[PDB]
Design a protein around this ligand. Structure first.
Ligand SMILES: Nc1nc2c(ncn2[C@@H]2O[C@H](COP(=O)(O)OP(=O)(O)NP(=O)(O)O)[C@@H](O)[C@H]2O)c(=O)[nH]1
Ligand SMILES: [Mg+2]
Ligand SMILES: [Zn+2]
Lengths: 259, 401
């Protein structure tokens, strides 16, 4: 749940939506950033389609048209730019962190998420900024940051605490050791490419998770870290990566393999 | 009022073992080359003189004259660097390696020991044979001997430095440990080891004595620095952003050139835009840190890309041999060179093995296990033979093309 401070989405807007139903002549998606407001994704707007148009995948889409009168909306995943697909994607993990927090803070304060999104998130919104970053300061600095926002003081503490020790008992780590060699004149750039090409848009496909790091541990021996919430999405994400590397590498003059 | 400039000259620091080479260098620069030396040590220092007062003492290491007499800020003469060679009989191979970056040297005889020690002789004839003639002898451990002992020896050093090419090869006693008399040594090296002229028109050619992966364990692929290749320029001059190549490069059997671009140029702690002869540079390259880690590219050479450099497997050498094998306790006569013999050909900063295929009066043909990259027709070469378990220098020569 991510209650929105609006009934319908601005036309021409981008936003995380989730595929809810696939029919013959079209498919109903669900606008997350808007209480799961059902929009319509028509074929003429789409495009392995087997994995995008999946039972519950979360893809990002543009808001074709909005009929404020009938109050219905149609979106497209084709109009979404490669730029809008990355930038408006980082917003996801952030907007996805804010979610888990409130869904937990409220669950604890025997309250409601809408109450959690209208006093907390909505108000931290006035103080310019992803309410998730204004909280970023709170835990480190002090609960003086929220109160100034006008965030009812029922949340303040429950928040802070529930924000810190959250990822902890929600964190798991998976890793692999690989070998990366090159003879290319700028082989250090090629390694900084093949890696940041294979380790790209992974934050959507093998989905969501918490953090990914690729570093040098030895000379040609590198390690990859996939720390997320779901232990069982371990390899899932780590395997795809370790493979993406090999593939792009074994095609980009960069020799890559697993130990 | 001093400047930040890269070293002007390279001064090797050779001698028998544990006679205190690194210590002396640490007594002149404050820096020490991280027990016994195994790899060539390196250190830099600015050398200035005190216009207003008495020498030796007038030779300052730092912009300050208020150390003996007084105040006008001493004048900068040059920034010198040292090549702290190992001394243990086993590492002979690496000193010769360093001998090829030496513009002058400082033989270091231990006062508290029977002067003519094996490595003392070896490093000595080794310099003469090579060309490192601008020599300075340094009696060093004086702080622990008789005022007659250290003078009886001076006699011998004087005796020894006779018939040879060591005419007036100054002998300056010091106490590297207590940094006593280091002033006159600077007076000495600032007189006999004169910075040589460097025509920068020549084709840039650098000898590599080191290479390594700078990346600390844990660095994210995000900020991985490319491999660094440490060496010494012998002629011309490289500048950042240049297309360079390492020879013989990486091996496959054959050796195909490793090309790259000079990412950075660094001398001592400071970074420059260009590098020239003298001093020890660290050429930052854009290539995978793997190619240049432990020290893989040691003995290679760097030249601008598309330069005419023969990389031979076989090489003709006009040679000469030493009458004895100064280096083993026993001064055994050097036996003729026999065909099908395995020798150690030390060329440039590179050391290699090869089986003699042809042998005449003063010319031998060697089939090397690794190719050598010949950038000139004079490439001095020193020849070692495995006399007794350990490798001994039995002669020298020139590589012809
Ligand atoms: N009394 C005295 N001891 C000295 C002097 N110079 C060096 N030593 C001592 O001699 C020992 C070896 O010194 P060191 O400088 O490592 O010798 P080196 O010739 O550089 N060693 P290597 O040949 O292995 O590279 C040390 O214990 C050092 O303190 C000196 O002038 N006087
Ligand atoms: Mg030493
Ligand atoms: Zn003075």
């Amino acid at each position: 749940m991510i209650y929105s401070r609006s009934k319908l989405p601005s036309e021409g807007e981008i936003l995380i939506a989730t595929v809810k139903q696939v029919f013959d002549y079209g498919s109903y998606v669900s606008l997350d950033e808007y209480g799961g407001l059902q929009a319509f994704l028509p074929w003429s707007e789409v495009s392995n389609i087997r994995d995008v148009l999946k039972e519950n995948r979360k893809v990002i889409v543009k808001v074709i048209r909005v009929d404020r009168r009938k109050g219905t909306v149609d979106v497209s995943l084709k109009k979404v730019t490669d730029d809008e697909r990355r930038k408006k994607n980082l917003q996801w993990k952030k907007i996805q962190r804010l979610d888990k927090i409130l869904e937990l803070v409220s669950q604890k304060l025997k309250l409601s998420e809408k109450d959690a999104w209208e006093q907390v998130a909505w108000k931290l919104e006035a103080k310019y900024g992803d309410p998730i970053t204004a909280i970023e300061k709170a835990v480190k600095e002090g609960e003086k940051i929220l109160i100034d926002a006008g965030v009812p003081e029922i949340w303040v503490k429950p928040l802070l605490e529930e924000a810190s020790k959250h990822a902890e008992e929600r964190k798991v780590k998976m890793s692999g050791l690989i070998t990366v060699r090159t003879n290319e004149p700028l082989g250090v750039e090629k390694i900084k490419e093949v890696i940041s090409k294979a380790l790209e848009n992974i934050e959507q496909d093998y989905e969501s998770l918490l953090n990914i790091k690729i570093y040098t541990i030895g000379a040609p021996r590198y390690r990859v870290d996939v720390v997320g919430t779901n232990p069982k999405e371990a390899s899932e994400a780590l395997n795809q990566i370790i493979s993406n590397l090999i593939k792009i590498g074994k095609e980009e003059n960069v020799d890559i393999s697993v130990v | 009022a001093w400047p930040k400039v890269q070293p002007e000259v390279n001064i090797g620091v050779v001698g028998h073992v544990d006679h205190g080479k690194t210590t002396l260098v640490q007594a002149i620069t404050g820096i020490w080359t991280s027990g016994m030396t195994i790899k060539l040590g390196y250190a830099e220092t600015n050398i200035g003189v005190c216009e207003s007062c008495k020498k030796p003492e007038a030779y300052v290491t730092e912009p300050s004259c208020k150390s003996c007499g007084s105040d006008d800020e001493p004048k900068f003469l040059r920034r010198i660097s040292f090549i702290d060679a190992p001394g243990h009989e086993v590492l002979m191979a690496t000193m010769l390696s360093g001998a090829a970056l030496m513009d002058g040297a400082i033989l270091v005889v231990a006062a508290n020991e029977p002067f003519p020690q094996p490595q003392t002789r070896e490093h000595f004839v080794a310099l003469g044979i090579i060309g490192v003639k601008n020599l300075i002898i340094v009696q060093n451990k004086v702080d622990v001997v008789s005022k007659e002992e250290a003078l009886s020896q001076y006699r011998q050093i004087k005796q020894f430095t006779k018939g040879t090419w060591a005419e007036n090869v100054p002998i300056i006693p010091v106490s590297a440990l207590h940094k006593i008399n280091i002033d006159s040594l600077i007076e000495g090296i600032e007189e006999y080891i004169k910075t040589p002229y460097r025509d920068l028109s020549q084709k840039p050619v650098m000898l590599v004595i080191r290479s390594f992966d700078v990346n600390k364990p844990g660095t994210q692929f995000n900020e991985l620095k490319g491999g660094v290749i440490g060496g010494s320029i012998i002629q011309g001059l490289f500048k950042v952003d240049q297309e360079i190549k390492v020879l013989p490069g990486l091996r496959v059997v054959s050796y195909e050139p490793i090309f790259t671009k000079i990412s950075s140029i660094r001398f001592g702690d400071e970074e420059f835009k260009e590098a020239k002869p003298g001093g020890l540079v660290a050429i930052g390259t854009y290539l995978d840190p793997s190619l240049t880690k432990a020290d893989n590219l040691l003995g290679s050479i760097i030249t601008l890309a598309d330069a005419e450099v023969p990389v031979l497997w076989n090489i003709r050498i006009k040679y000469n041999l030493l009458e004895r094998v100064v280096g083993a306790k026993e001064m055994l006569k050097v036996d003729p060179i026999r065909a099908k013999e395995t020798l150690m050909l030390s060329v440039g900063s590179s050391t290699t093995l090869g089986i003699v295929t042809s042998v005449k009066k003063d010319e031998i043909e060697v089939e090397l296990r690794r190719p050598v990259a010949v950038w000139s027709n004079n490439i001095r070469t020193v020849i070692s033979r495995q006399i007794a378990g350990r490798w001994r220098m039995i002669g020298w020569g020139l590589v012809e093309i």
